[PDB]
């Protein structure tokens, strides 16, 4: 568990958002879906260091 954080690095529309979710499948789920209704859809990559999510369109 603990709280993620999603950075949304597109080449048209930018933005951030964090959740509490139980383990990283969900965390990426939930972030997943929460890209694709900004439109974003990149490269995902993460950072456990800092429960960190980064998608680059």
Same mark, same amino acid.
């Given at each position: 568990?603990?709280?993620? $954080?999603?950075?949304? %690095?597109?080449?048209?529309?930018? &933005? #951030?958002? /964090? ?12 972030? $997943?879906?929460?890209? %694709?209704?900004?439109?974003?859809? &990149? #490269?995902? /990559? ?12």
């Amino acid at each position: 568990m603990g709280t993620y $954080k999603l950075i949304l %690095n597109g080449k048209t529309l930018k &933005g #951030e958002t /964090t959740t509490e979710a139980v383990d990283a499948a969900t965390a990426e789920k939930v972030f $997943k879906q929460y890209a %694709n209704d900004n439109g974003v859809d &990149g #490269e995902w /990559t993460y950072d456990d260091a800092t429960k960190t999510f980064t998608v680059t369109e």
